[PDB]
Design a protein around this motif. Sequence first.
Motif, PDB file in Angstrom:
ATOM      1  N   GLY A 101       0.834  -1.215   0.000  1.00 58.56           N
ATOM      2  CA  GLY A 101       0.000   0.000   0.000  1.00 58.56           C
ATOM      3  C   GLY A 101       0.858   1.251   0.000  1.00 58.56           C
ATOM      4  N   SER A 102       1.803   1.327   0.937  1.00 60.22           N
ATOM      5  CA  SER A 102       2.644   2.517   1.106  1.00 60.22           C
ATOM      6  C   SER A 102       3.920   2.157   1.830  1.00 60.22           C
ATOM      7  CB  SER A 102       1.914   3.552   1.963  1.00 60.22           C
ATOM      8  OG  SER A 102       1.699   3.084   3.287  1.00 60.22           O
ATOM      9  N   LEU A 103       4.941   3.020   1.782  1.00 56.51           N
ATOM     10  CA  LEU A 103       6.155   2.785   2.587  1.00 56.51           C
ATOM     11  C   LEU A 103       5.814   2.776   4.095  1.00 56.51           C
ATOM     12  CD1 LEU A 103       9.195   2.343   3.032  1.00 56.51           C
ATOM     13  CD2 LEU A 103       9.564   4.748   2.624  1.00 56.51           C
ATOM     14  N   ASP A 104       4.886   3.621   4.518  1.00 59.32           N
ATOM     15  CA  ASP A 104       4.455   3.658   5.907  1.00 59.32           C
ATOM     16  C   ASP A 104       3.872   2.342   6.404  1.00 59.32           C
ATOM     17  OD1 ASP A 104       5.280   6.245   6.357  1.00 59.32           O
ATOM     18  OD2 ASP A 104       3.267   7.105   6.288  1.00 59.32           O
ATOM     19  N   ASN A 105       3.034   1.693   5.589  1.00 58.46           N
ATOM     20  CA  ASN A 105       2.429   0.416   5.966  1.00 58.46           C
ATOM     21  C   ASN A 105       3.506  -0.660   6.045  1.00 58.46           C
ATOM     22  OD1 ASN A 105      -0.068   1.742   5.857  1.00 58.46           O
ATOM     23  ND2 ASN A 105      -0.813   0.649   4.038  1.00 58.46           N
ATOM     24  N   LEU A 106       4.417  -0.689   5.078  1.00 61.78           N
ATOM     25  CA  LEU A 106       5.533  -1.631   5.141  1.00 61.78           C
ATOM     26  C   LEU A 106       6.345  -1.461   6.403  1.00 61.78           C
ATOM     27  CD1 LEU A 106       7.620  -3.779   4.175  1.00 61.78           C
ATOM     28  CD2 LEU A 106       8.694  -1.949   2.912  1.00 61.78           C
ATOM     29  N   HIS A 174      11.963   1.222  15.435  1.00 64.91           N
ATOM     30  CA  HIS A 174      11.389   2.375  14.750  1.00 64.91           C
ATOM     31  C   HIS A 174      12.470   3.336  14.225  1.00 64.91           C
ATOM     32  CE1 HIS A 174       7.479   1.279  16.941  1.00 64.91           C
ATOM     33  NE2 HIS A 174       7.363   0.935  15.670  1.00 64.91           N
ATOM     34  N   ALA A 175      13.514   3.561  15.012  1.00 67.88           N
ATOM     35  CA  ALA A 175      14.544   4.528  14.652  1.00 67.88           C
ATOM     36  C   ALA A 175      15.476   4.029  13.562  1.00 67.88           C
ATOM     37  CB  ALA A 175      15.343   4.948  15.881  1.00 67.88           C
ATOM     38  N   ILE A 176      15.599   2.716  13.413  1.00 73.00           N
ATOM     39  CA  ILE A 176      16.549   2.180  12.427  1.00 73.00           C
ATOM     40  C   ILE A 176      16.191   2.585  11.002  1.00 73.00           C
ATOM     41  CG2 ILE A 176      15.668  -0.185  11.943  1.00 73.00           C
ATOM     42  CD1 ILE A 176      18.523  -1.148  12.275  1.00 73.00           C
ATOM     43  N   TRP A 177      14.900   2.813  10.746  1.00 73.83           N
ATOM     44  CA  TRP A 177      14.471   3.261   9.424  1.00 73.83           C
ATOM     45  C   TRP A 177      15.158   4.580   9.049  1.00 73.83           C
ATOM     46  CZ3 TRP A 177      12.128  -0.066   6.297  1.00 73.83           C
ATOM     47  CH2 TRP A 177      11.487  -1.156   6.879  1.00 73.83           C
ATOM     48  N   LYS A 178      15.519   5.407  10.031  1.00 72.50           N
ATOM     49  CA  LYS A 178      16.228   6.663   9.755  1.00 72.50           C
ATOM     50  C   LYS A 178      17.580   6.438   9.058  1.00 72.50           C
ATOM     51  CE  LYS A 178      14.295   9.196  13.701  1.00 72.50           C
ATOM     52  NZ  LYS A 178      14.671  10.189  14.747  1.00 72.50           N
TER      53      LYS A 178
END
Lengths: 194, 194, 194, 194
Positions: A101-106, A174-178
Amino acid sequence: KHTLPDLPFDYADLEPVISHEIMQLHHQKHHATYVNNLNQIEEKLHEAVSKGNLKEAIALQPALKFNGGGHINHSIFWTNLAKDGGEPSKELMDTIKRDFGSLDNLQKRLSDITIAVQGSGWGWLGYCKKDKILKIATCANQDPLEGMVPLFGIDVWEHAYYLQYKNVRPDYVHAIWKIANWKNISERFANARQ
Amino acid sequence: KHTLPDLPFDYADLEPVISHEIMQLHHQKHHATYVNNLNQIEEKLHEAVSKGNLKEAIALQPALKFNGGGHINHSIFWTNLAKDGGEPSKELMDTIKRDFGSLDNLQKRLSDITIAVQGSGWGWLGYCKKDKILKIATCANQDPLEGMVPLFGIDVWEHAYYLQYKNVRPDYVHAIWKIANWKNISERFANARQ
Amino acid sequence: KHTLPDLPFDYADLEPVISHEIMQLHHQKHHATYVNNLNQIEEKLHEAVSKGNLKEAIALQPALKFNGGGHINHSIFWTNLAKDGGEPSKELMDTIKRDFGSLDNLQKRLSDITIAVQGSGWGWLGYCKKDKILKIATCANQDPLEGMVPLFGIDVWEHAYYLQYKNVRPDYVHAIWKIANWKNISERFANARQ
Amino acid sequence: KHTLPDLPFDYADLEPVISHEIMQLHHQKHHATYVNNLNQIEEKLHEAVSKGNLKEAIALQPALKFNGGGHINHSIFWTNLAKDGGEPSKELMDTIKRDFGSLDNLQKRLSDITIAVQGSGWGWLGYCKKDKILKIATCANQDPLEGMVPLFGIDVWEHAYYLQYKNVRPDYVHAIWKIANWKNISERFANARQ
Ligand SMILES: [Mn+2]
Ligand SMILES: [Mn+2]
Ligand SMILES: [Mn+2]
Ligand SMILES: [Mn+2]
């Protein structure tokens, strides 16, 4: 013999998401240990299989999976992190959108299953070449991702985060995506898709 | 290369405890298949190890354990059965008494855990060399007995009994003691204590 | 509802073997979390079993084992540690000598298998009431010790040691014997043996 | 309390694909045993939970999964078989095409993974509600399909075929498609999409 790869960045380059001290230990101690143990095991397994020493070959299996997986997983992991990783390629974003759906959902979905690993393990975004779709999965301990091509891994052994985050694994995930190296991840996606 | 060992008796020699139809299928089809698949898997594993293809070598482990274990387990099992087994050697009997109180107690306890196996697997009497004691255990599927020396195995895969006993596994497990080859089990015990 | 037990000592009392910061996190965060999650799970499992909601009851199993095991394991662990624990009781030392040769052999053997846990888990000294002997074993993740009565546990999740010992798990396992609460362990042995 | 459901056909109604001797044993003995053991285990579990006996409740989990799963799986399986199944509903067929290319491709792929099960277990077509796609999977022993909705199951425990097919599992797996109850599978699919 297998060797410890150099990091593609300096030990402090992922701060403030992952500390210098964690990078230094994780690379120079934890990954090094897997590599050192793997080389010993590999050599023994070659011996036993050549000689048809079956019971020995089978007994060596957990150690080859653990250390060999450890080498595989951490080698990918270092390439998957960057101070400035960029953004997904156009093709990869398109596919993320299609399959999630989106990068956010992934991110939420992979973060959630990764957070939920009981004990030590890894979360993975991968590409399944048979069904031609992105998938997410987790692996226990150092079991390597099988059945799909690895694109991005998140290490949730406690040693990956504890010195900085202590018990708060979710904040680390959560922070690792940064610091996700989307250049590398996008290259792995292109290679899986050829 | 691994080969299917000849049985040490004729296919009907264990009747009425195990039927000749079972013995034939069990050896000529089931064991033969493990052997044939083992040789192929071992070849693939030797190639992966030679090439340094770690992921491939790790991926072949379940198949090597299953087929390799299959070969180990059945090879032992044929030697563990006979029409005229004899009785335990004096040293094995004294040790059965030291570790389980009586042969009766050993048979009951091993039979019970063997009957209780969920799905396919095996019950074992083994000898633990570190602690110099007899122990009983079960293994799933074709996982070989590890951590102790196998002395006597009971196969409780449904193919080991179903044609004769149907669902009544307990009648098969209780009956098999009548054809336990105590000559072989005693020789294995002697070897384990060297 | 299940509750977080108070420690039988102050957070800094095990220094310099286990730091104040580790004790504080381990008790107030890690054990607390197991307890909090367990109470939620327990309540759901009671619901599903009462109603015969079978697929739900089965799905809840991993979470009850993990959190319930976490509560069980850590509750025992805190009672097993002390600034000044004493020495084994006469009966317990006698039994250690019988089953392992010496306290030194037991420590080395339990330390070794505990060190070797792949990923997260626990090492245990236990008492097996059927065979009437001390045994050592390991458990993965928070799986509770089953089949024998727990006497002394060593937590080797990374959170049990990392802040102080970092990657050097063996040093922590070796040093923990300095703070083994032999009074408590000896009481558990007497109770298992009644 | 759980009860053994009546078959939706007579014991000989699936011949020549599955024999009446198999159907009788499979339902009256194997399924009945799962049901009988399930009721006992559920009672013991409810007691342990009521008493707050966490270790006891955790210890009963394997037995609840095995017998509870046994009941779930076989209950579904009987509804999944028929002499006159019909054909997939148009919506199920369109979805089979969307997700696997053709019914042929689905049958081959599911048959192959089912045949490949090591030991006892099951192959499944399921529907994943998060991603709104069909998927195929296998389960060990009596572990129920989790994470997706079961549509069609193939039992590859040796008791499901051995009396007729002996060691030739592939002939049974390939043949079972001839008696797949597409009316039921289509109804299950419709329900899964609600
Ligand atoms: Mn790591
Ligand atoms: Mn067999
Ligand atoms: Mn802990
Ligand atoms: Mn069945």
